[PDB]
Amino acid sequence: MIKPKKLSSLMKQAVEETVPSIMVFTTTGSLLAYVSFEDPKDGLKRLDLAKRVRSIAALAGNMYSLYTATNPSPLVAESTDDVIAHQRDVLFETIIEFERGKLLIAAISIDGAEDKLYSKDPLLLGIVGTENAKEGMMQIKSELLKECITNELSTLGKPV
Amino acid sequence: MDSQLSENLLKCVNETYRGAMLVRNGLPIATAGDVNAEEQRVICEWNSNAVSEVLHLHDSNTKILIATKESCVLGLIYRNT
Amino acid sequence: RKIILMGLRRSGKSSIQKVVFYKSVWDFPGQVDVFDAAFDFESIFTQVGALIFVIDAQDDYLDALARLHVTVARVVTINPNICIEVFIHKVDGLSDEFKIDTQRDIQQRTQDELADIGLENVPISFHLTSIFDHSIFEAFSRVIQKLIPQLPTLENLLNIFCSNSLVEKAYLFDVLSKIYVATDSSPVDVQSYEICSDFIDVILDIGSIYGRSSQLKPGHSPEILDETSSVIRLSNDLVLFLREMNQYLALICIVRADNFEKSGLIEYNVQCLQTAIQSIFSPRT
Amino acid sequence: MRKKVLLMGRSGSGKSSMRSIVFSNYVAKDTRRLGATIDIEHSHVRFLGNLVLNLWDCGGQEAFMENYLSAQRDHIFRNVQVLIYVFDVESREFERDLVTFRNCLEATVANSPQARVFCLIHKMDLVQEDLRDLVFEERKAILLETSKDLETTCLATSIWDETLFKAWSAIVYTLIPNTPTLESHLREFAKAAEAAEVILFERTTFLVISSYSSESNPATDAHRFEKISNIVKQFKLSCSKMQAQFTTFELRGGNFSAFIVPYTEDTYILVVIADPEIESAVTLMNIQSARRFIEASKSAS
Amino acid sequence: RKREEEEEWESKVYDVAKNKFIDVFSLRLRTEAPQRDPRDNIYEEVLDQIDSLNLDPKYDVAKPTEQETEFIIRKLGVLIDDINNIKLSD
Numbered sequence: 001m002i003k004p005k006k007l008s009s010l011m012k013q014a015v016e017e018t019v020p021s022i023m024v025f026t027t028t029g030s031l032l033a034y035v036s037f038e039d040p041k042d043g044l045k046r047l048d049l050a051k052r053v054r055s056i057a058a059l060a061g062n063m064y065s066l067y068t069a070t071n072p073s074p075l076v077a078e079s080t081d082d083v084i085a086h087q088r089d090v091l092f093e094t095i096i097e098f099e100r101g102k103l104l105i106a107a108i109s110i111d112g113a114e115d116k117l118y119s120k121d122p123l124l125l126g127i128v129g130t131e132n133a134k135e136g137m138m139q140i141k142s143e144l145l146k147e148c149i150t151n152e153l154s155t156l157g158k159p160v
Numbered sequence: 161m162d163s164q165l166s167e168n169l170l171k172c173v174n175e176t177y178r179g180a181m182l183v184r185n186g187l188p189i190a191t192a193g194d195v196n197a198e199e200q201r202v203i204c205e206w207n208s209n210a211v212s213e214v215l216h217l218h219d220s221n222t223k224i225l226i227a228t229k230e231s232c233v234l235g236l237i238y239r240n241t
Numbered sequence: 242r243k244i245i246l247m248g249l250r251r252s253g254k255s256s257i258q259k260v261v262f263y264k265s266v267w268d269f270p271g272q273v274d275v276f277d278a279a280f281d282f283e284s285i286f287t288q289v290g291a292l293i294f295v296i297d298a299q300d301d302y303l304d305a306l307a308r309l310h311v312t313v314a315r316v317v318t319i320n321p322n323i324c325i326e327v328f329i330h331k332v333d334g335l336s337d338e339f340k341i342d343t344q345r346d347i348q349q350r351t352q353d354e355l356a357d358i359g360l361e362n363v364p365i366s367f368h369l370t371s372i373f374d375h376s377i378f379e380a381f382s383r384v385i386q387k388l389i390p391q392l393p394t395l396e397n398l399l400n401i402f403c404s405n406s407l408v409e410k411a412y413l414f415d416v417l418s419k420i421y422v423a424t425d426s427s428p429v430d431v432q433s434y435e436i437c438s439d440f441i442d443v444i445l446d447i448g449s450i451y452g453r454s455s456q457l458k459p460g461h462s463p464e465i466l467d468e469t470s471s472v473i474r475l476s477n478d479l480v481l482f483l484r485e486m487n488q489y490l491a492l493i494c495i496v497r498a499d500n501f502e503k504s505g506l507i508e509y510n511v512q513c514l515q516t517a518i519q520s521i522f523s524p525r526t
Numbered sequence: 527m528r529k530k531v532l533l534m535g536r537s538g539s540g541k542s543s544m545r546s547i548v549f550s551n552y553v554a555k556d557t558r559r560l561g562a563t564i565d566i567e568h569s570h571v572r573f574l575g576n577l578v579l580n581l582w583d584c585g586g587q588e589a590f591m592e593n594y595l596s597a598q599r600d601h602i603f604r605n606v607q608v609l610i611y612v613f614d615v616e617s618r619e620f621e622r623d624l625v626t627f628r629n630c631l632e633a634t635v636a637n638s639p640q641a642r643v644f645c646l647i648h649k650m651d652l653v654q655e656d657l658r659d660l661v662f663e664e665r666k667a668i669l670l671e672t673s674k675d676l677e678t679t680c681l682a683t684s685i686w687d688e689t690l691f692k693a694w695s696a697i698v699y700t701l702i703p704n705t706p707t708l709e710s711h712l713r714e715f716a717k718a719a720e721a722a723e724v725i726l727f728e729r730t731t732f733l734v735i736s737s738y739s740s741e742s743n744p745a746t747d748a749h750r751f752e753k754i755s756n757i758v759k760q761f762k763l764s765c766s767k768m769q770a771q772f773t774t775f776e777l778r779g780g781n782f783s784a785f786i787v788p789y790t791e792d793t794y795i796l797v798v799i800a801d802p803e804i805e806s807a808v809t810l811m812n813i814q815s816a817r818r819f820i821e822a823s824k825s826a827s
Numbered sequence: 828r829k830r831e832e833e834e835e836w837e838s839k840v841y842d843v844a845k846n847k848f849i850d851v852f853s854l855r856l857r858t859e860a861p862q863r864d865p866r867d868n869i870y871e872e873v874l875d876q877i878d879s880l881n882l883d884p885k886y887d888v889a890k891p892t893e894q895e896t897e898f899i900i901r902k903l904g905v906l907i908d909d910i911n912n913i914k915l916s917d
């Protein structure tokens with residue numbers, strides 16, 4: 001069992017002014033949990049924010065799934081074929097820069113089991129930035145949120 | 161941004177070094193002072209074998225103090241005049 | 242504008258309003274017609290754009306056809322913008338060979354006497370209705386599509402939405418009456434339409450059972466509720482999904498589960514179609 | 527595991543209509559073409575895997591049921607789990623029905639003293655609505671006076687509403703063993719997944735096997751389970767018209783979210799979340815976590 | 828006189844919703860395709876013959892004094908310790 005309030009409390013402490021929204025979704029764009037910088041009080045102010053976050057996750061899951069079928073690892077580091085045999089790589093970070101924001105898509109390598117609570121779709125951590133945001137701090141926040149979510153989801157397979 | 165990194169970056173900037181620039185091997189992490197009108201991309205794209213360098217543009221008059229170890233680069237912005 | 246359900250006695254009009262209307266539709270009786278001055282017929286027929294005549298297939302209909310022809314002549318002499326539709330009714334007990342021959346006989350008997358009268362400019366449609374089937378809902382939907390002046394814009398929107406999102410079939414239902422306002426250019430299967438009609442029944446019944454907290458608050462809801470969205474996956478590699486468009490409208494689409502792996506893009510196109518529909522149906526200048 | 531269920535009653539009380547609607551996937555309008563039942567129609571129903579229900583659809587005529595109490599007394603009333611006697615409320619011979627019900631009760635006590643009696647007072651839709659309660663309590667005061675020999679509950683049934691599924695769910699709830707284990711499983715699943723209401727159905731008949739409603743349940747209707755059973759049976763018939771099998775249902779209401787997914791090989795589970803902040807994709811694999819847990823439990827066992 | 832303005836409004840909102848859609852069918856793997864235009868490559872050399880910009884990264888090197896080098900190597904170590912001293916919970 002996954003508690004989305006636990007994930008919202010875990011992602012609420014990694015949110016600053018330059019990082020408005022942090023969300024966790026699947027590769028098909030299905031949103032699991034998300035946070036925000038300012039908490040809305042109006043109902044419609046929550047609804048349009050949820051629709052925007054759902055659209056961002058829906059586009060970002062397909063933008064991750066376009067790049068997951070490409071292996072550029074043999075096209076670097078000219079060495080022996082055993083090294084190429086050790087290059088079975090999967091995508092784990094993706095940064096997209098815009099004029100009025102930044103987007104970071106990082107795949108959460110869930111522990112416990114290879115078929116614990118996902119059917120060949122890794123959970124993706126989406127970090128939304130702004131113009132004044134810095135991409136290197138977003139990578140540190142992404143690796144901290146990944147190593148905390150993986151330890152949080154290591155106790156999955158909850159019974160009855 | 162943490163508070164101790166913010167006060168350390170405020171300790172980076174002074175009346176001599178008017179701009180502080182913290183950056184990884186390829187991505188920025190922290191800025192202070194006047195970091196604008198280029199003078200950030202040249203710090204991000206910078207790479208050399210040695211560890212202590214002083215660089216200024218030949219079409220400008222801004223001198224940058226650059227150190228690089230453990231995949232972390234610190235840039236200090238001050239005018240050459 | 243109103244919808245007038247004409248016909249004769251024992252034609253099936255009251256059963257039509259029991260099935261469709263009782264789960265502006267007006268039922269004139271099978272007697273005291275336009276020759277009688279019991280009602281202001283010229284005042285009503287100016288404000289009425291759709292005229293429906295119910296014809297029994299099993300019973301003799303030549304007197305019904307003469308009454309239909311004099312009613313068409315009356316409403317054309319009242320206003321030239323009325324739409325005339327013919328509802329061939331009580332086809333549940335008829336065989337498959339009987340329906341085509343009855344439709345051919347009724348259409349050949351009607352469209353030649355239309356030329357014999359001389360009012361060849363007006364279009365008269367023909368529909369095969371039965372209260373025990375869903376063909377009465379489809380016939381009333383095709384009647385309602387003529388009255389809406391915004392049908393080609395919604396039809397082109399549904400066409401480009403079905404072409405862009407790989408959606409096999411789309412309808413724009415009204416949830417209270419199970420009558421679809423618009424559909425795409427592909428034909429309407431009866432097997433698709435039955436499950437699309439009962440999808441609204443399942444959604445409305447479960448939302449009536451469990452939508453008790455807030456929902457029907459008398460003053461106002463303190464929080465704005467989400468739109469009702471549903472997804473049903475079937476075993477024959479087909480997915481049905483609904484999204485609530487307006488306070489009375491919904492969009493049921495049929496999509497293969499191969500194409501529902503990219504359901505986020507279909508959700509984005511559904512949101513853009515929601516914006517288009519809510520901007521079309523808003524009051525403007 | 528075989529359970530023997532007797533379905534007795536007067537002539538034309540509607541026993542074959544209930545058997546066809548609940549178990550043989552009929553509708554209410556198709557039971558008008560049902561013929562008379564000659565002697566006993568034995569039915570074997572696979573209900574929840576290893577449990578098999580032996581339904582003895584006995585004929586309600588007088589020459590059949592004089593033969594039931596005289597010659598076939600050892601064949602019928604021995605090893606009876608649940609005796610269902612059906613009472614027509616529109617019958618003009620209720621005093622004649624009471625003597626025959628007493629004879630069937632005496633035969634059931636003399637042959638199988640550990641059995642449960644269900645008195646289904648059928649055809650309640652023929653009674654006007656405001657008289658539909660105090661008439662039924664008029665009969666319920668009589669039969670509970672009559673049936674002091676065994677455990678007896680009287681239920682008002684009709685095939686034109688939701689009371690039939692309530693009565694047959696109450697009948698088959700006693701036949702299912704270890705129901706506190708399933709109730710504790712549903713309680714722990716609703717506590718773990720933060721669900722307001724968890725209802726477990728059967729796959730074919732869609733009878734409510736078990737349910738658990740928390741204090742945060744938005745539904746206030748006391749007859750909601752059989753209504754939802756009628757909804758999913760009507761949609762299963764709608765899918766069977768298209769020659770397709772309904773697998774998953776997902777809903778996102780204004781303040782709720784209902785999910786109908788298969789739980790075991792013979793069950794369907796309805797999970798209702800009262801929190802709109804919980805997304806569909808969290809709950810749709812929160813159910814799959816418990817499904818993988820019970821699959822790992824049933825693989826070893 | 829007013830229906831044509833409504834028709835123009837519906838035409839422009841149809842154009843808006845047509846431009847706002849996503850072509851899902853174009854968003855697939857159309858790869859493993861033969862080449863189409865392998866000949867039009869001489870435009871690359873005739874445009875990038877010189878084009879006045881083939882210029883290396885400049886960063887014109889002066890030599891650091893030991894005071895500023897000591898200052899920045901003392902500052903970079905404690906900033907690296909600040910980087911690895913980060914934590915999610917406060």
Ligand SMILES: Nc1nc2c(ncn2[C@@H]2O[C@H](COP(=O)(O)OP(=O)(O)O)[C@@H](O)[C@H]2O)c(=O)[nH]1
Binds near residue numbers: 254330332371372
């Ligand atoms: N079995 C069957 N009966 C029908 C059908 N359509 C109409 N009827 C019957 O025909 C009768 C027609 O009555 P109707 O003309 O509507 O009454 P009026 O509106 O007052 O003139 C109804 O009472 C229905 O019972 C049908 O499709 N099937």
Ligand SMILES: Nc1nc2c(ncn2[C@@H]2O[C@H](COP(=O)(O)OP(=O)(O)O)[C@@H](O)[C@H]2O)c(=O)[nH]1
Binds near residue numbers: 563
């Ligand atoms: N109105 C009403 N009619 C019923 C009900 N149950 C059964 N019937 C009708 O009564 C008849 C009973 O026939 P049947 O089930 O074969 O009686 P059995 O021989 O005792 O099993 C059926 O044709 C049904 O149409 C009910 O609850 N309400």
Ligand SMILES: [Mg+2]
Binds near residue numbers: 562583
């Ligand atoms: Mg029978």
